[PDB]
């Protein structure tokens, strides 16, 4: 009845002083059966990071389509794509079809190359825009992440502190979803480099 | 085509004739055409004839204005078709 | 440059389309056909030329009917007028289908004129070579329009095309002057027969055959039908009386 939650998935995004924290789980399970722990749901598009949660085939199709669009944009403008443009492009892309829309919970995280302020936004299955300065999370377990993030998130955190904050906001809620686990990956966006980190989870 | 040349020659022709004090050649030479040194005398002859027709023995501004419309209309070319420019 | 008449949409240096002019010149090589706008309706008339006597009399007709109240009489390239009246009938049928009101005469004129000019805009279509004297009766009254191959139509009080076009119009003017207040259909049919006879004098070498038809409210109450019986013979011998 609901193919979106069949494959499962969670995603979390944090904002900070010139830093953005985005984390995701590595588990891909089919209905009641887990399949692979190598599946990553975050992809690199220039200096903008996009994560997809939901149906895996929708995830990879959207990954390729967005890579295609940003490759064309980069070849046209001779430079990367600003995340402010990226979120609206994602919102428009999902609205191409209405009767057979993709079942995804994508979120776009990145930092503007000129202003440098953190940017983060999310969408829904249809593609409704959602921009908040605090945090946007998505996935089958979003109810678990929302309350924990509200309890744990404090504005204007030190960039190293966002990693621990998002780790506590993710792991203690990841175990509360049957379709999430098998480790996790945390991405921290900084103006100079991106910190890619893994986290340890119980296997259940 | 120079404004100064047309002004000079218009004044030279007007000095011999009987231009009224309230008649301005500068109003006649506002637009820059390709006016020759001969047409800008036959125009004043036509203005004088127009004034003579109305029994006036001194040409007025109203006849100089009408003279420009009858001796110099167009060279045709493409100006009859505005969309070319 | 030469060849300004090879194509259709090309403009001549004086601005006159040339294929349309040749179509007009082709129109005049056709059977004469007149129409009289009487007070109540219209009265058409044709002079279908009798060829070698093998042709069956009183069978081949040229006054085509559109709907009930619009009549079409054509001269020149007869098939081209056949197709034109076919499209006109289709337009009238569509109008009556989606408005359920009989097509008014000026509307039919607009439709036919727009179709006719559609064939003198392109390079891949030959302009029509048929002039029509189509007319009839509608709610507002009676109308008689001549259509020309250039696509120009006018609300004539009487018109004629054919070999005897010029002769017919003179008698049309004489009839109009003789009866300025108007004319009745009954006398209009006899006058039309007389006019056709006068026009046929140019083609006296070949035999003639007269067919006439009229649409009116006083007698036909908005229905179009030919003239049969003693009325046609009465018109014929009245018009032959003055000869």
């Amino acid at each position: 009845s609901d193919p979106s939650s069949i494959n499962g998935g969670i995603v979390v995004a944090m904002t900070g002083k010139d830093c953005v924290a985005i984390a995701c789980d590595l588990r891909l399970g089919s209905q009641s059966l887990g399949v692979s722990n190598k599946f990553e749901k975050i992809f690199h598009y220039g200096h903008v990071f996009l994560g997809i949660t939901g149906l895996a085939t929708d995830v990879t199709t959207l990954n390729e389509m967005f890579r295609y669009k940003t490759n064309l944009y980069k070849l046209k403008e001779e430079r990367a794509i600003e995340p402010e443009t990226f979120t609206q492009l994602v919102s428009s892309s999902l609205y191409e079809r209405r009767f057979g829309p993709y079942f995804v919970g994508p979120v776009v995280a990145g930092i503007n190359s000129k202003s440098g302020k953190p940017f983060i936004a999310g969408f829904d299955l249809i593609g409704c825009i959602d921009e908040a300065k605090d945090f946007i999370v998505s996935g089958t377990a979003s109810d678990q992440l929302f309350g924990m993030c509200e309890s744990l998130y404090e504005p204007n955190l030190e960039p190293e502190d966002l990693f621990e904050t998002i780790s506590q906001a993710l792991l203690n809620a990841a175990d509360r979803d049957a379709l999430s686990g098998w480790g996790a990956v945390v991405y921290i966006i900084k103006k100079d480099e991106v910190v890619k980190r893994y986290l340890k989870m119980r296997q259940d | 085509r120079d404004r100064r040349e047309r002004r000079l020659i218009f004044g030279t022709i007007a000095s011999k004739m009987s231009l009224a004090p309230e008649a301005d050649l500068d109003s006649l030479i506002i637009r820059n055409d390709s006016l020759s040194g001969a047409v800008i005398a036959a125009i004043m002859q036509e203005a004088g004839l127009r004034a003579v027709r109305k029994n006036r023995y001194v040409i007025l501004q109203s006849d100089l204005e009408e003279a420009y419309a009858t001796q110099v209309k167009t060279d045709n070319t493409v100006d009859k078709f505005d969309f070319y420019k | 440059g030469t060849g300004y008449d090879l194509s259709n949409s090309v403009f001549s240096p004086d601005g006159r389309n040339f294929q349309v002019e040749y179509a007009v010149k082709a129109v005049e090589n056709g059977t004469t056909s007149i129409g009289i706008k009487c007070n109540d309706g219209v009265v058409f008339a044709v002079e279908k030329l009798i060829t070698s006597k093998l042709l069956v009399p009183q069978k081949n007709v040229k006054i085509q009917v559109v709907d009930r109240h619009i009549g079409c009489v054509y001269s020149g390239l007869i098939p081209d007028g056949r197709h034109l009246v076919n499209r006109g009938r289709e337009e009238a049928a569509s109008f009556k289908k989606l408005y359920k009101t009989p097509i008014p005469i000026p509307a039919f004129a607009d439709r036919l004129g727009q179709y006719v000019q559609a064939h003198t805009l392109y390079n891949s279509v030959r302009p029509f070579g048929v002039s029509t004297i189509f007319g009839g009766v509608d709610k507002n009254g009676a109308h008689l329009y001549m259509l020309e191959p250039s696509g120009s139509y006018w609300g004539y009080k009487g018109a004629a095309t054919g070999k005897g076009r010029q002769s017919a119009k003179a008698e049309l003017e004489k009839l109009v002057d003789h009866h300025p207040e108007g004319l009745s259909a009954r006398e209009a049919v006899k006058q039309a027969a007389k006019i056709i006879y006068l026009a046929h004098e140019d083609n006296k070498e070949k035999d003639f055959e007269l067919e006439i038809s009229w649409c009116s409210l006083s007698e036909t109450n908005g229905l179009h039908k030919f003239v049969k019986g003693d009325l046609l013979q009465e018109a014929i011998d009245f018009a032959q009386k003055e000869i």
Partner: protein, 243 residues
């Protein structure tokens, strides 16, 4: 080769010969018209030439009311004028349906000019043979006169002339407009502007008009209509007794 002058292609002098020849087709009817702009209304007056007595004067006219608020006067061969009238009426319909409000004159003029430009650019099409003068009153802008051309060059006019003597009427009105320094007639009543236009037209053409030689179109605030013959006779009588 020599096929340049036949279709809308550029020329060694950089000219579109077909469009140039199209303008010479607008003077076939040699009908002179002019339109002035009143303080609150607009009036357009055109010569009404009836060639033959067989014509019905009522149906022969070069003035077409596009809508209840926009009127149009067209110079050139009538069949192409009627094609343009049909397209303009249909497009006014489409715009009113789609946007819900009556369109201003400039939008209609721009759309017809764009259509004519598409006609010129496409080789298989031929340019329109008419010059259209769109006249209306715009509550958003004011009274306005718009004149397009076969090429598609449209621009609002304080007062428009046309016909073979377009230049002469142009100078005749320009002397008045340059002496009075006003962009429109100061006469508030639509009654007065009609006599102003008729007087200037008579002085320009040097001819005296009767009830049937001229047809006048009046566009008041949210109303356009064509005056009947008795109205023109009354206006002429008033002019004659006044001056």
């Amino acid at each position: 080769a020599g096929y340049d002058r036949h279709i809308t292609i550029f020329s060694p002098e950089g000219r579109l010969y077909q469009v140039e020849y199209a303008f010479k087709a607008t003077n076939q009817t040699n009908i002179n018209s002019l339109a002035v702009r009143g303080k609150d209304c607009t009036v357009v007056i055109s010569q009404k030439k009836v060639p033959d007595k067989l014509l019905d004067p009522t149906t022969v006219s070069y003035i077409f009311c596009i809508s209840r608020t926009i009127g149009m006067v067209v110079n050139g061969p009538i069949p192409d004028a009627r094609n343009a009238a049909l397209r303009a009426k249909a497009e006014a319909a489409e715009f009113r349906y789609k946007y819900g409000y009556d369109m201003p004159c400039d939008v209609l003029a721009k759309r017809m000019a764009n259509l004519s430009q598409i006609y010129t650019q496409r080789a298989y099409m031929r340019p329109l043979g008419v010059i259209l003068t769109f006249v209306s009153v715009d509550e958003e802008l004011g009274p306005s006169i718009y004149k397009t051309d076969p090429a598609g060059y449209y621009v609002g006019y304080k007062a428009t002339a046309t016909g073979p003597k377009q230049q002469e009427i142009t100078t005749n009105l320009e002397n008045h407009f340059k002496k009075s320094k006003i962009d429109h007639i100061n006469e508030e009543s639509w009654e007065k502007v009609v006599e102003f236009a008729i007087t200037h037209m008579i002085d320009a053409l040097g001819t005296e008009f009767s009830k049937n030689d001229l047809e006048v179109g009046v566009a008041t605030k949210d109303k356009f209509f064509t005056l009947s013959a008795e109205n023109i006779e009354e206006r002429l009588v008033a002019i004659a007794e006044q001056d």
